[PDB]
Amino acid sequence: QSCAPGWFYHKSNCYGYFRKLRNWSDAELECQSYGNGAHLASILSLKEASTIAEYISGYQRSQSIWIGLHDPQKRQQWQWIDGAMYLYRSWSGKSMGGNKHCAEMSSNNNFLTWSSNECNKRQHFLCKYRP
Numbered sequence: 001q002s003c004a005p006g007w008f009y010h011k012s013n014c015y016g017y018f019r020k021l022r023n024w025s026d027a028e029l030e031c032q033s034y035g036n037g038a039h040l041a042s043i044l045s046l047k048e049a050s051t052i053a054e055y056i057s058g059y060q061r062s063q064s065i066w067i068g069l070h071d072p073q074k075r076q077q078w079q080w081i082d083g084a085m086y087l088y089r090s091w092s093g094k095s096m097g098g099n100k101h102c103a104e105m106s107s108n109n110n111f112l113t114w115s116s117n118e119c120n121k122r123q124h125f126l127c128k129y130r131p
Contacts, residue, residue, distance in 0.1 A: 003129070003131070010055070011051075012131060013128070013129060013130060013131050014129045014131065015041075015052075015126070015127065015128045015129060016126075016127065017056060017065065017124070017126045017127075018124065018125060018126070018127065019063070019124055020124065020125075021122035021123055021124065022122055022123075022125055023119060023120050023121065023122050023123075024040070024066055024070070024101075024102040024104075024119040024120075024121075024125070025119050025120070026122075027040065027066055027125035027127075028040050028068070028081070030127070031127040031128075031129075034129065036129055036130065037129075037130045038127055038128065038129045038130075039068050039081045039082075039127070039128060040066055040067055040068035040069075040081065040125060040126065040127060040128070041065075041066075041067040041068055041126045041127075041128050042067075042068045042080050042081065042082060042084060042128060043067060043068075043069070043080065043084070043086075044080070044084040044085075044086060045086070046090070053112065056126060057112070058112075059110075062105075062107060062110060062112060063107060063124050064104055064105055064106065064107045064123045064124055065104070065105055065123075065124050065125065065126050066102070066104045066105075066123060066124070066125040066126070067103070067104070067105075067126065068080045068081045068082075068128075069099060069102070069103040069114070070099065070101065070102050070103070070119070071098070071099050071100065071101060076098065078096065078099045078103065094111075094113050094114070096114060096116065097115065097116035098116050099114075099116045100116040100117060100118055101117075101118050101119040102116075102117055102118065102119035102121075103115065103116055103117070104117050104121070104123065
């Protein structure tokens with residue numbers, strides 16, 4: 001039940017991926033359920049995604065993993081749960097589409113490109129926990 005039994009300690013924090021098909025609504029709720037501030041992978045800069053991606057990259061088996069990226073109230077703005085605000089995101093050779101109600105990585109894109117989808121598509125999801 002602690003952060004170690006089979007759990008991997010990375011970045012001094014505890015995080016783990018789940019290969020279960022769960023909608024973003026049941027996926028995120030399953031995280032904050034710990035009330036420890038647990039939520040879907042949070043990314044404010046490419047530096048963080050660059051290190052975690054090296055682990056979940058999946059170049060040998062890229063799976064559709066969800067992250068903590070969603071739209072506010074249809075204001076055409078992409079923000080994370082904590083309201084994280086990315087400053088000038090990279091955009092070249094890809095298309096966000098609008099992130100609709102929830103954005104995720106399409107398994108068809110080998111470059112792990114992001115894609116907009118409804119928060120009702122049951123798919124894999126990665127969770128994060130703050131120490």
